[PDB]
Design a protein around this ligand. Structure first.
Ligand code: SF4
Ligand SMILES: [Zn+2]
Ligand SMILES: [Zn+2]
Lengths: 752, 131, 103, 98
C-alpha cells in the first residue's frame, strides 16, 4: 500500500500491514528525525526486514538530504534475504510509480562467494582464493604481461573486462541479489566482487556483514567509500559483541610458530637472493621509508597489502618507520627474534594471564624489542613482501599471524589480555600449548562505528534485555522499546520442561552428560515429539560435543531407531558444505511430507541466519540452556572484565548470553502471523529465566507452563496442533492482528 | 644434536643431567657435566671438532632462544646496546636523526653478527665506549 | 498396519479416474490419519499430473495439518486452502463427513 | 551401515569385511552425486567464508568434534555423516522418472 507517516510517504509492498510494523516505522522515523542511536526489538515472524527497507528507502528518496543506507547483518544468507526483500520492495515501487528511479543496491561479501573464474572456484578456503585473485590481479602481472607477452603469467578475464567499461556502466540501475548478480556477471563475463567493491560509493543502499564494519582487516577499505552521514541499520545484532571479540583476537599454536620460523628462513633466503640480483628494488623502498612514506603511499589503489591491518585506522601511528625495521635484513632479524621470543614464551607448564604492557616490558628486557617497531610490523612486512615480488605467498602465510600479533599487542594495552595455556585440549596426552590474545572490551571495535555515524538502528528479532547492550557497548540510545505482537489467537505456545515423564529433573550440564536417566527422558521426549509433529522438527543443543555424545549413545541404545520410523535424521556436521546438504535435504523432506528431524547446535552455524518457517519449523526442541564452557580462560577473563568495569555479574552475563542464544533459536521458527511452531525448553534452569526471555515470547509463556513434565507438554502440543489445524476466522483478525489501508487510516485518525 | 651432547655422547633420556650450557664466544651443545670436567681445571679450547676458540668456565650461561643464530644476535645486541643507549630525549625530540642512529646501530649489530666488517666496527665500538 | 503412501494412492486414483468422461467431475477424498508419508517417488510430479488432469482432492486429516496435504489441496483446488479440513472432536468428524456429500 | 560405532574387539566376518574399504569408496562416490551448489538462502558454506581473513579465538573442545587420547577422531562424527548420507540417499531416490 501507500500511506503517510507525518510528511513521509511510505510505499509498503504488501496490501496489508501489521500494526507492529507501523509502530516500528513510526519509531524509526522519530529516531531518524532525532538522528541518534536506538535499539528496537522488532519481534520475529512479523516483517522486521521489509518494514526497515520500505521506511528507509522512503526516507532516502523523499527527503532532500538523500542519506545513504548501510545494512549490516550477521550472515551472508541474511544479506541475500535482505537483498531479495529489497528487490521485491523496489519492484513494487517501480510498479506503483510507473518508472524505475535512479537506484543502486548491492550486497558485499568475500571473493569466495563472488568468484566466476573456472580455475580458482573449487578451493575450499577463502584465503587461497584471495591470494590467487591477487596474484592474477595485482597489476604486477598485467605490466609483466605487457612487457613480456610470452610470459607464463595469466590474467583473469572477468577482471580485465571491467577495464573496458566505466564504473557506473558495470550494472544497470536497481538491486542485484547474489544469485542475480552472479547470473548477470556470468552472462557478461565480469567479476562480481570487483563490481561490488567499486560501487560502494555509488550505491544508495549497501548490505554486508558485521565483519565488513567491525573487523579492521576488511573494514578499512569499505568504511572509506561510505558516507559519514549515512543511515546505519544493524539487523540481528544481538550477538554483535562476539563479532567485536572476533574482530580483535588471535590464537597462535606451536605449529604456527614452526611455520613462522620456516617462513622467516624462506624470507631471509629470498632477501639474500634479491640483494644479490638487484638492490635497487630494495634501495628505492629504503629511501621511501626514509622519506616517511607509509604503506598507502607505496601501494597503489588496485593492489592490496599482503598483511591486512589488524588495528583500528585511528590507532595507527602517523609517524615514519623507527628505522630498526627499515632495512630489510634488519626487519627479517627483528621478526625472527620476535618469533623466537614467542616460542620461548610458549614453553610454560601453567596458564599465564598477562597484560600487553607486561608482555612488552618482558619482551624489551629479554629481546630488546620496543613497542614502536612492533606497531609498524604488519605494514613493514607487507611492504617487504611487495618489494620482494614473491611468486609464492603460501610459505609466508604464518608470518601474517606473527605480524597481526605484533601489531595488535603493541597498539592495544587497555581492555586486552594475553592468555598462555600449556594445554589447548585437556584430553590430549601430549601437551599442546596455545597463546590467545583476546579482546575483552567489545566496545572497542564498535566505538568508531558510533563515532563516525550519528544514527545507528540496532535491531534483532530477540534482542533482550534492551538495557544490557548500551552498557556492554559504549553507546547511548535515544529510545529503546520492545514490541509485543497483537495476536487474535496465541500464535506460538512456549513451555518450560523442568522434569521428565518420570518426574526426574533434566539438565544439560557438561559433567552430567553421561547420566542414564536424563538421557532417557531426553530420548523419550524426542521420540514422543517426533510421533506428534506433523511436518518437521529442529532440535538445538548447547554444544557440538554434547550433541555428539548424546546422539551416539542414543544410537547405542536404539532411541534413534524409533525416530527413523517417523522422520529422517539430519545432523549438523562441522563441515559447512555437508551441513548445507543436510539443511537442504531437511527442507526437501519437510515439503514432501516425509518428515525430518534436524539436530543442530544452538550456538552453531545453523543457529544463526537460517530460518525454519511453516513446515520447516513446527517444533524447536531445546535440549538445555546453551551455556558456554565456563572453565575456559577467555570467558572467565571477559567476565572479570565486565564485572570490574561495567559492574555486570558473571552469572548474570552468562545467563544473558545463554538465554539470548536460546531466544534467537526460538525466534528462527516464525515468519508471518499465520506461521506457528511450539517452543519447548527441556531444562530445569529455564524456569527461573522467564524474565530474561524477550517480551513477545514472555507474553506467550503462561505461568502454568513454567514447570511442565514430558507428558503434559506432549498433551499441550497435541492440543495446540489440533487447535490451529482449524481455519481461523477473518472477522476475529480483520483489524486487530493485521491491518488493511482503511484500518491503518482509521488508527491514524484515532491516534490524533 | 638437539637431544644428545656429543662431547660426552649422552642422550637426554638415560642421562637427564645434560643442560643447555652455551658459550657467548662460540655457541655449542655442551652439557654441565662436560663443563665441570674440562673447564674446572682452567681455560681451554672448544671441545667441539672444527672449533678451537679459548673459553672460560665462568662465562658460561644458558640459552633462552631455540635458534642459535637468534641467541647470538640478541647477545651481540646486548653487547652493543650497553653503550649505545641514546633515546628520543637524548636527541631532544629529533625524530629523523633518531632513525638514522637506529639504522646505524642496527647496521653495526648486523656487521658484528655476520663478521663482514668486524674489525672496523669493533674499533668504532671501542672508540665509542671510551666516550 | 504399515506406513502410508500418499503418492501410491494418488497414482491409483489417477489410474481410476482416467476413463472418467469430461462431463463427470473427478474428485478424490483422502481420509489421512498419519502425520508423515513414505513415497516411492516425487509426490510433486504426481500433484502436477493431478492438476493437469483436473482432479480435485479434498483431504480430511486426523492429527494435525500436514504440509504436503495442504499443498496438494491448494494445487488441486485452484488455490483454495479451505479444502484441507481437520477435525476437533467426534461430532466435528461427523460434520466433516457430511460436508463432503455436497457437490 | 546401521550407524553403530566400530570397535576392534569384534571379530566381524572376514568374507564380508573385505568390502569395508570399498564401501568407504562407495561413500566417497555417494558425495560424488550428493555435493552440488545450493541457493544463497541456505548457503552455510558462504556464511563462514564471508570473512576470509578472520583469525579470532579458536573455539573450545565443546564446539569441536571429540578426539582420542592420541588426538585422532573417535569416529562418532562418522556415524553422523552416515545417517545424513542415508537421509540424502533416501531423498535423492525420490528424484527419478517415477
Ligand atoms: S577477479 Fe573476480 S573472477 Fe577473477 S579470480 Fe578474482 S574474484 Fe575470481
Ligand atoms: Zn656433555
Ligand atoms: Zn666452539
Amino acid at each position: 500500500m501507500k500511506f503517510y507517516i507525518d510528511d513521509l510517504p511510505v510505499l509498503f509492498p504488501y496490501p496489508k500491514i501489521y500494526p507492529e510494523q507501523y509502530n516500528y516505522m513510526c519509531d524509526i522515523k522519530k529516531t531518524l528525525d532525532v538522528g541518534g542511536n536506538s535499539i528496537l526489538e522488532m519481534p520475529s515472524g512479523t516483517g522486521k526486514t521489509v518494514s526497515l527497507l520500505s521506511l528507509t528507502i522512503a526516507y532516502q528518496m523523499h527527503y532532500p538530504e538523500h542519506r545513504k543506507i548501510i545494512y549490516c547483518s550477521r550472515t551472508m544468507s541474511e544479506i541475500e534475504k535482505a537483498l531479495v526483500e529489497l528487490e521485491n520492495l523496489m519492484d513494487y515501487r517501480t510498479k506503483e510509480l510507473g518508472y524505475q528511479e535512479d537506484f543502486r543496491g548491492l550486497g558485499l561479501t568475500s571473493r569466495k562467494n563472488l568468484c566466476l573464474h573456472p580455475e580458482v572456484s573449487k578451493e575450499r578456503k577463502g584465503t587461497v582464493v584471495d591470494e590467487k585473485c591477487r596474484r592474477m590481479t595485482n597489476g604486477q602481472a598485467k605490466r609483466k604481461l605487457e612487457e613480456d607477452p610470452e610470459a607464463n603469467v595469466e590474467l583473469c578475464e572477468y577482471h580485465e573486462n571491467l577495464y573496458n567499461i566505466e564504473v557506473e556502466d558495470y550494472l544497470p540501475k536497481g538491486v542485484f541479489s547474489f544469485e542475480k548478480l552472479l547470473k548477470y556477471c556470468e552472462e557478461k563475463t565480469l567479476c562480481p566482487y570487483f563490481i561490488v567493491r567499486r560501487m560502494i560509493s555509488l550505491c544508495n543502499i549497501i548490505i554486508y556483514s558485521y565483519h565488513y564494519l567491525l573487523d579492521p582487516k576488511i573494514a578499512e577499505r569499505v568504511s572509506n567509500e561510505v558516507s559519514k552521514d549515512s543511515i546505519v541499520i544493524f539487523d540481528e545484532a544481538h550477538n554483535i559483541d562476539n563479532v567485536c571479540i572476533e574482530s580483535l583476537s588471535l590464537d597462535l599454536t606451536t605449529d604456527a610458530l614452526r611455520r613462522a620460523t620456516r617462513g622467516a628462513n624462506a624470507l631471509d633466503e629470498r632477501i639474500s637472493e634479491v640483494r644479490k640480483v638487484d638492490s635497487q628494488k630494495l634501495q628505492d623502498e629504503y629511501e621511501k621509508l626514509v622519506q616517511g612514506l607509509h604503506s598507502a603511499d607505496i601501494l597503489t589503489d588496485q593492489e592490496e597489502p599482503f598483511v591486512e591491518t589488524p588495528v583500528l585506522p585511528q590507532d595507527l601511528l602517523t609517524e615514519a618507520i623507527p628505522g630498526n625495521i627499515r632495512r630489510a635484513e634488519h626487519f627479517v632479524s627483528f621478526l625472527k627474534r620476535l618469533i623466537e621470543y614467542l616460542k620461548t614464551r610458549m614453553k610454560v607448564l601453567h596458564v599465564i594471564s598477562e597484560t600487553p604492557k607486561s608482555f612488552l616490558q618482558h619482551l624489551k628486557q629479554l629481546t630488546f624489542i620496543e613497542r614502536k617497531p612492533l606497531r609498524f610490523c604488519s605494514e613493514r612486512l607487507s611492504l617487504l613482501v611487495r618489494t620482494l615480488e614473491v611468486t609464492e605467498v603460501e610459505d609466508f602465510t604464518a608470518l601474517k599471524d606473527i605480524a597481526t600479533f605484533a601489531t595488535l599487542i603493541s597498539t592495544y594495552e587497555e581492555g586486552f589480555l594475553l592468555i598462555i595455556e600449556p594445554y589447548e585440549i585437556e584430553n590430549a596426552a601430549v601437551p599442546n600449548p596455545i597463546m590467545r590474545f583476546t579482546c575483552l572490551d567489545a566496545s572497542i571495535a564498535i566505538k568508531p562505528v558510533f563515532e563516525r555515524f550519528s544514527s545507528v538502528i540496532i535491531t534483532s528479532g530477540t534482542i533482550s534485555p534492551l538495557d544490557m547492550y548500551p552498557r556492554m557497548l559504549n553507546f547511548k540510545t535515544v529510545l529503546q522499546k520492545s514490541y509485543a505482537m497483537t495476536l487474535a489467537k496465541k500464535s506460538f505456545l512456549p513451555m518450560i520442561i523442568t522434569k521428565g515423564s518420570d518426574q526426574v529433573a533434566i539438565s544439560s550440564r557438561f559433567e552430567i552428560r553421561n547420566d542414564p536417566s536424563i538421557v532417557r527422558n531426553y530420548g523419550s521426549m524426542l521420540v514422543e515429539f517426533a510421533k506428534i509433529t506433523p511436518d518437521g522438527m529442529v532440535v538445538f543443543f548447547p554444544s557440538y560435543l554434547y550433541m555428539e555424545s548424546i546422539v551416539s549413545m542414543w544410537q547405542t541404545m536404539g532411541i534413534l531407531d524409533e525416530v527413523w520410523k517417523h522422520k529422517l535424521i539430519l545432523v549438523e556436521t562441522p563441515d559447512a558444505q555437508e551441513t548445507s546438504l543436510a539443511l537442504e535435504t531437511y527442507r526437501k523432506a519437510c515439503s514432501n511430507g516425509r518428515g525430518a528431524i534436524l539436530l543442530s547446535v544452538a550456538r552453531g552455524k545453523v543457529s544463526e541466519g537460517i530460518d525454519f518457517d511453516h513446515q520447516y519449523g513446527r517444533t524447536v526442541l531445546m535440549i538445555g540452556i546453551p551455556f558456554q564452557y565456563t572453565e575456559s580462560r577467555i570467558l572467565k577473563a571477559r567476565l572479570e572484565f565486565m564485572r570490574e568495569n561495567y559492574r555486570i555479574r558473571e552469572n548474570d552475563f552468562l545467563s544473558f548470553d545463554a538465554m539470548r542464544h536460546a531466544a534467537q533459536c526460538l525466534g528462527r521458527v516464525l515468519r508471518g502471523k499465520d506461521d506457528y511452531g511450539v517452543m519447548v525448553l527441556a531444562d530445569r534452569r529455564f524456569s527461573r529465566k522467564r524474565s530474561q526471555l524477550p517480551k513477545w515470547i514472555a507474553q506467550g509463556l503462561s505461568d502454568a507452563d513454567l514447570n511442565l513434565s514430558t507428558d503434559m507438554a506432549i498433551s499441550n502440543t497435541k492440543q495446540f496442533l489440533r487447535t490451529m489445524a482449524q481455519p481461523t476466522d477473518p472477522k476475529d483478525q480483520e483489524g486487530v492482528s493485521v491491518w488493511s489501508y482503511e484500518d491503518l487510516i482509521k488508527h491514524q485518525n484515532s491516534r490524533k | 644434536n638437539k637431544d644428545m651432547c656429543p662431547i660426552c655422547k649422552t642422550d637426554r633420556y638415560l642421562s637427564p643431567d645434560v643442560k643447555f650450557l652455551v658459550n657467548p664466544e662460540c655457541y655449542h651443545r655442551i652439557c654441565e657435566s662436560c663443563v665441570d670436567r674440562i673447564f674446572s681445571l682452567g681455560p681451554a679450547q672448544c671441545p667441539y671438532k672444527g672449533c678451537d676458540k679459548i673459553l672460560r668456565k665462568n662465562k658460561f650461561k644458558t640459552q633462552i632462544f631455540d635458534d642459535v643464530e637468534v641467541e647470538k644476535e640478541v647477545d651481540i645486541r646486548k653487547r652493543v646496546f650497553n653503550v649505545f643507549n641514546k633515546t628520543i630525549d637524548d636527541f631532544n625530540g629529533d625524530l629523523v636523526e633518531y632513525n638514522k642512529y637506529l639504522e646505524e646501530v642496527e647496521d653495526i649489530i648486523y656487521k658484528l653478527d655476520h663478521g663482514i666488517d668486524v674489525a672496523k666496527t669493533e674499533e668504532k665500538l671501542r672508540t665509542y665506549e671510551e666516550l | 498396519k504399515g506406513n502410508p503412501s500418499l503418492q501410491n494412492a494418488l497414482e491409483m486414483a489417477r489410474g481410476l479416474l482416467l476413463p472418467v468422461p469430461a462431463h463427470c467431475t473427478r474428485e478424490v477424498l483422502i481420509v489421512f490419519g498419519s502425520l508423515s508419508t513414505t513415497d516411492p517417488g516425487d509426490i510433486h510430479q504426481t500433484i502436477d499430473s493431478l492438476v493437469s488432469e483436473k482432479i480435485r482432492v479434498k483431504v480430511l486429516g486426523l492429527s494435525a495439518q500436514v504440509a504436503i496435504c495442504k499443498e496438494l489441496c491448494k494445487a488441486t483446488n485452484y488455490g483454495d486452502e479451505s479444502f484441507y479440513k481437520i477435525l476437533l472432536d467426534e461430532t466435528h468428524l461427523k460434520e466433516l463427513f457430511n460436508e463432503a456429500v455436497t457437490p | 551401515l546401521r550407524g553403530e560405532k566400530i570397535m576392534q574387539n569384534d571379530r566381524g566376518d572376514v568374507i564380508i569385511d573385505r568390502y569395508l574399504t570399498l564401501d568407504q569408496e562407495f561413500d566417497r562416490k555417494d558425495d560424488d552425486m550428493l555435493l552440488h551448489p545450493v541457493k544463497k538462502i541456505i548457503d552455510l558454506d558462504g556464511n563462514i567464508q564471508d570473512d576470509p581473513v578472520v583469525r579470532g579465538n579458536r573455539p573450545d573442545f565443546t564446539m569441536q568434534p571429540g578426539v582420542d587420547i592420541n588426538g585422532n577422531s573417535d569416529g562418532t562424527v562418522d556415524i553422523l555423516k552416515g545417517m545424513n548420507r542415508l537421509s540424502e540417499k533416501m531423498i535423492m531416490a525420490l528424484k527419478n522418472e517415477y
